[model samples]
Target: GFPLITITVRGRNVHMKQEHYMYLWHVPLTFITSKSDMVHRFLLKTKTDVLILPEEVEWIKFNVGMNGYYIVHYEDDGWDSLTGLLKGTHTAVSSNDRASLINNAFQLVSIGKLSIEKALDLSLYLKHETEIMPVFQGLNELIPMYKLMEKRDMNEVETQFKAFLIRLLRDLIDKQTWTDEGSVSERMLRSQLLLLACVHNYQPCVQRAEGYFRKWKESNGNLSLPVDVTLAVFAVGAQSTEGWDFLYSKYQFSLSSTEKSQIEFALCRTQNKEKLQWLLDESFKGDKIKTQEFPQILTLIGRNPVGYPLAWQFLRKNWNKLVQKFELGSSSIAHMVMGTTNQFSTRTRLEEVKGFFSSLKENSQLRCVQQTIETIEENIGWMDKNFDKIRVWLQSEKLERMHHHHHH
Candidate 1:
């Protein structure tokens, strides 16, 4: 639901329409209980100024000291705070109205009025606390579910879907015996295998899945299962100590970078360390790695006793050059550096990083550079010239009373 909103950028001050419906939205999705607390934090990051306007518009303008901005509504003044819009309303509404609300939300999403994340966040609050209907509806909206699925195994969702599949399989199997299953497409059989992998410890399911794998193998020698279906079987086989060779051979050419990462974290067992490390190196080449890989790679580094030995060495050797190339910020390098101290001593690793920072041309003029230096120093035990430089920068008038002195 979008209201009328306008934004203006004037030098260091960013102005937004008003405070009536004028609420701030921040990135890196987080959930907080208090709206005032949220507003307080947003304000601390930026100095805000209200504009002079008629009592009608009341909020003629709002200002932000940082990159964050505001959202304003048309003339609907039914709500006094962002809480209702964010958490949604509790007042009774018909099912028709609810569907219309969700449908319109997606219409806004399609037109870019709402972020999928914000829409999903709101959806979480839409259902009765005791009810699960919204849960199923939310899952039906796959993108949001996919975003959250990557965050964890979501075993509960998997269990629910697995049961649904099991029922469907029983129904499908009842209609005809396996001997007459020739009418079933391999795609249907592949889905059955995928779902069975999620069921966990179902030997009968695994036996049937193996038959499907064998049929595919007989059709094409050593060619592997459909790339789409290979990982599911690999995941199940990994558990029973049977599928690594097939997965690796499929991965040799058919697998994608995303799937390779999936294998490293989900399917690969601890005994497969050598192969995991090789995939880690192959998937995350210095600058080639995307920022999203930070957590996945962090988990990978944590598993190895000495961290990513090869990655750490490469960063150590190219420390100075790579920083300049990537314009690496504290957050950018935070995971790679801090992720390793689980094995390497902080002081030793800090020294390597300190040398890199020391070698850089004076970055005092760049707030991000100064902040990055400060962040690294604070995270590491050792403090140095960069720390002092950041301290002075923090006190400077150039420093607005904002969380980020400059935006990344």
Candidate 2:
């Protein structure tokens, strides 16, 4: 006897007359048996369907290669089974499917369909993953959380989160080492992992970045470093006063616009407020930095946690001057507004942003301003909804690991 499974496909516009005939065709769904070996494949051709599955099937994985344009939600039991598989023998799922699972899980969280804890549970399997896609997907998803923590000054939570990431990335980082030997994809993975590791202050990664950066500095920008890791090295280097001075000097002297731009980005990553303020102050002098690069500089500075509040202050203090300098109706003005204000999340910050923009006489940059306001509101909403949940999850996870270590 075969067990019957019912799957319902839903769409927002399903009730409209034009939607009646619009059904996804040939969507591949795979069922993994409890033993984690047997597999069953099914194709859905209608909005409602029954699949005759073998009695022992445990869970279904959807969007097989992530080619189909849809989100997948698993029931509690289904998610448990898949999570078990991922934690135990993750290779049972394809790399693309692993990436898709992480992507879908987070997407569900954003839509309020999935809990942040559950999404994070799905991401836990990435520690064993070496493929670029899944790891990248996991890191990319967590970036917003990192930003929120930084914005809210949740230092302890941020530190715990970074420890978690370092642990998760340790295996891959150790394997890749400092040498850039691998296939293009592999090298790219190394680059991404090293950047994250260093950014999170993983000691070995930071040491390596510093070594490369110091060598480059000693050679006066003449030493050729691996192109893939230069950004990471520059980022780590720019965190210190001497490194900032060196990069700023290079920015001034380097004739290659590309190198200068890279240096500009690196310089913004400095945690030192005085150095960042100096750069922002220097940006006003056209001879020091190009007028066209001002928006980029502002945007980069705004992206940095240390520089965000500083950049916001600078933007407001020089609002009229900036408008006149960049000229009204210039896209640079819109870029400046969007880049500087996009990271803002909170009721007070949103109000302050809106109040400032509302008082502006020129309405030409209104669209970007409105767009940024919406983005800020969304950020506030996301933080309000998920911040506590994520904090609890991180703290609990840390405790669990500590207990496990004690047992060891």
Candidate 3:
């Protein structure tokens, strides 16, 4: 069994072999400068053996003297191993040099010549074309770029990486389908893009993915697509009745919970309270709900406060599931209810408000909803005071009316 390193590849958690852990047993102690250094050297030596360096061997980096080592360049196509790098070097250059550096970097790792840390350093400095490996291998190579970003502190590169990914993905999406030219390849690409969009929480990209499907349908005359392909577009918050009917007509034979939930979300948005409640009950009969459906359900019920009776029932049934699944937003929704609780108390009873408050107080075991419970209790307390005053005023009026009638 190999040692495992937790790393993200295309937003997936994979346990890759911690080669260094195993490699330590194989390397000679005398040759090891440090643990990291040895690992890099080991990888470089092993990878280079298989590298088949070209005859030209463009020594992008040459004449390096670090413990009698010759660190020459083997770019995908760098600074000299000796002088480090030149000022104004590779900041903005329109040339193959950048490609060469990235390719070399990829090659380094491809052959186990570089650790992820060293590879990212090379990739960052060289401004390696992020998606070139995909082009080379005839696939979307964004996984490596995502892995590279994961290797670094997300805060450091999140801003840059987001910008880089959006641009790269846009081009990737467009190039693959050429704006939905009505072909199998285009539809499949659109489907994959839709899945990727949902996976990444790129709602805007979800909207764009629908555009491809929309165009494909217009050209194809029926928009007949795989049930999953049809649903992926529909699920990402699509809002067209025509589009929904077209897809649903095809996929109506079998509806996934996800398909129903996504449809329910759109339904809850536009339908009446009765329909919304029906959807809530339909899509969410189970005690535990999905993460995708959780937020939409919360917002749907929250927006339709008249559905409070049913909503309260749903919350009571699935409170833990909601907290377990979507804590932050769930807490926010709980607070939103609390924020509007005083007004609702006027419509409801003191016992009702207190009952709901107690429900949250009991369920505040979750760290995410602790503040929500506290905030709600305070609001309910104020409602309790206001309701007490209202009760006294109504009682006094009733007593005065009775006295006047008796005196008369």
Candidate 4:
């Protein structure tokens, strides 16, 4: 049941365009719901946003996160106001206590109140606070914010967010903590917030924050930025002087000659000529790509491109497991690309993405398969930051439309 919602775009040509961040499509892939709601609620209050998927209702946790009281507060408030006119949601604050900053994120995006710039800025900041606070206390503040923002003014949101961003920046400078302990500091470094902070405040410090970090990195002197703040720095808004090179330094993925071709195809969806050109060029060496004992490289080259040759090489080496877990269709030469027969749920699709490894079915290796899948999921949990970017982009891209949603 491999079912993909028929995603449609109406703005410009739906024609395919090739480029690196092509996986940037993931942004629209996730946000189709929020943007549609912004459009629809702006159009009508009685309907749901067209781009909404069943999954979006769970969006709050991803925004403000679980470290604080966000989950408990979001659930209580999210549902209470969800069934009626959105304005009554009271997302600003519940019980005089501040709403869960994370919980409010859903409502803000649901209505038009949380603009793309604001959302990217807010979530960029909240993800940090979440890990530092109790799961529910954070939820409490997030929920209250959700209720209040419905009636709050744009100027206030802009004003409040500025203080929040600088405060976060100042805090990062003081503590030397960009991410949680043991988080990926090397491969996991992209400061989106700096862009937003610069957009809101032209202060020389904000400018220094971006330039300082980059220059520091060049001199190999020292990069003091906390992981999340750099992402916050990327959020530096319109005067994005730091530009794509900054973002690229972190996200520019590369693979060996063969793997490099596949990664580009997934993102840009370009023709084979460009793909081949890169392959022929030795600059496309796969050596820089990191892989551990498991088939991390194999796993990443999942389900894209018309046909991938190296993938078949890996499958041939382990065909038995592929045959058992991934059934092939008339068109399917390999099982790793797409599950041709059965549709999958989000929970199952994400967590169980690589379950039927040729390794999983072997009687003695069943436990090994289970353990490996669990480990894979644990690593994926760290990717929430990129996931949010995709969601925010989807909204702005206008691929999604809102029908009836409450903001305040």
Candidate 5:
């Protein structure tokens, strides 16, 4: 917890170039961005004993054996009194010069729309480059460029972004390998790019994420890949296998009730219910029901009693276990096909309730569904009885009032 103050790095002869084209992967990287300021603000408000300058100081953000994409640029000087960055060796770039231009370029870099004259100049300087695209280190400047985009150049920005994307994609294809290290680098790059996309509100970047995701899933849902890497891609991109054609052709596995539930949950979130539901059913045709996934199991039971008859069947088959370790979320939703009742009816009918229970008893052996039904019914009955008593009291008072008025 340190006192908050603005951190400014003044640079002499700061050469800021704005180009609208370097955004590959279709991210709407523009000439203005907003997150650069947030980074500065965070630094100012936090208890950092040193001034943190934003730029990638590492040799390349995606060096071999590296598993992340965030840039760490800092240096330690004995004069800690001045509050400078402290991580890796870094040369300070002065933010004191007019940041209006470089700042503006950094802002619009996400969606492929920015004055990329700097990117072009730097890129041209890189006549010999390999798979990893040029990593732009100074996020401090990109944030502002996105914030100040004038509509006059929106079209120009998009055209350049598209061209850049094609080249970037090509570069990516060229650089990627079937090896594990290549996979990690691509995964890390995707993560950083997604961050840039979200902060900049870029859509193309998301689409690019989709490409990698599809490819990953095609490669074993990437079972061999790290879970964090796989899920991170989905979370950031709002990933969906909805339009994924490759996974569609695979044989459905015989999943446990638990797997069914997870499939449905995934479908529900994706909102592609019909196909996904069928896929769940088809996937589970061969394997016995799995119960390790409690979240899915409980939700499936809640969907409808029929939907989880297998759960009931399993319950009947394993009632002893249920008594020992009954799952709560799923146990709550099952219906007694045999024990049925009406709870809050103004007049409680014994025969109707009994009739329902008689029918429900058919499944009660597996269910103990009778107890759950009765619990719900009795709770409603008590609630109804209280309301009826109040009603009777009000009616009696009304009758008395009528009698008094007649006498008057």
Candidate 6:
């Protein structure tokens, strides 16, 4: 049986002016249902109210074309019905709203208005999705969840989650293939998927990217690879000593600042600890990298799992040198401080950061230091609250996939 459902309307006035309330008082809304071509349009005149619906309608979708100013949420049954449609035809809902649905689901999860399982269930529709917006939105939202799993050291859950993501991305990755032929948007989507697949160690993606990287290397930088695939190729290329040597040489001589920047970014994706440490050490010398770019480089390295500990240690050991180089009260110093410490999610790391900051004589970067501590505390709190629940969901998902594979 279909569960009971209710649609609620909420309002907010962005400006403090009373005139803003007048517009918020009545918002135009439209609802589309699976049963009919007719869209139910009405003005939501109050803060909250229930709308009567025809009994024959099995499901309803709101915010048609997603043009409305406010966020729309449905009761449990409404969410389930929408999830059903998303997993089924998906295109029945417009692409814009499909993206909105993914965005709103994560927003709801953040606010405790929706369950993580439900939000994840809604995202499962991405397995069948082709539209770039919805797919991008879904993947973007899962990044923090992935980070949380990584920080908490939930290896089994993280593995299952990546497997699930690879599965969700499988059809689209195959459909897009390695060729750069497509619309600008399609090529961008292909690049995004291939980069993600390669990051997750998807073998086919890695092999294809390696082939392109080697071809470009053999041609001695004269062979122009497609702009879209360079990042993935460079990332794969950075994994090996020969590929790293080739890329570093190119970085030294590359005329295009854009290409140089891409190589710099891709080099950080290498999992080799020694290579990352070397990059971190080189960042301080100002010979290969400009002074302005090193803070960003530090941040990028700090964000890498292999580079995180090294970056933190580098920052601490060279604090005085960085302070002198950037000068007191410089925004670059703040950026360096924030980037190196913001990804920490353990209480011990949080206290260590606090202790390190407290030991400093400078107060100009105090605000940045405080913000980093707050971010770390927030991460620790979030992981403590959600780790078990997310682990259970991932385990069940993994088991379900195994069961499905066995049947076929």
Compare the candidates by lDDT and give the number of the best one: 6
Q: What are the models' TM-scores?
A: 0.31, 0.85, 0.31, 0.25, 0.24, 0.86
Off by over 4 Å in 5: 1-212, 215-225, 229-245, 248-269, 287-358, 365-408
lDDT for model 6 comes to 0.77
Which is better, 1 or 4, measured by lDDT? 1
What are the Cα lDDT values of the candidates? 0.40, 0.76, 0.41, 0.33, 0.33, 0.77
Lowest summed-lDDT stretch of 10 residues in model 6? 13-22
Give the per-residue lDDT digits (tens) of candidate 5, residues 9-79. Answer: 22211111212222111111111111132212111122222333345222111001123221121111111
Report backbone clashes per prediction: 0, 0, 7, 87, 66, 0
Residue 58 CA displacement from its true place in model 5, Å: 49
Task: Provide the clash count, candidate 4.
Answer: 87
**Sort by lDDT, top down from the best:** 6, 2, 3, 1, 4, 5
Q: Report the lDDT tens digits of candidate 3 across residue range 162-275.
A: 444454355454443323455564455565655554435465666665675677557643444454354455544334556545543433443466555545544444324665
lDDT of 1 by residue, 150-257 (tens): 223344543443343343234333232233234245444444435444334355555665665556445543544555454444455444334555545544554378
List the lowest-lDDT window of 10 residues for candidate 2.
Answer: 13-22
TM-score of 6: 0.86
Q: Extract clashing residue pairs from model 6.
A: none
Looking at model 3, the pairs that clash are 43-113, 75-104, 76-100, 76-103, 76-104, 77-100, 77-101
Model 5 TM-score?
0.24
Expressed as tens digits, the lDDT of each residue in 99-131 for candidate 6 is 988987776665566888898888888988999
After superposition, the stretches of candidate 4 with alpha carbons farther than 4 Å from their true spots are: 1-213, 221-290, 293-408
Q: Is candidate 2 or candidate 3 better by lDDT?
A: 2
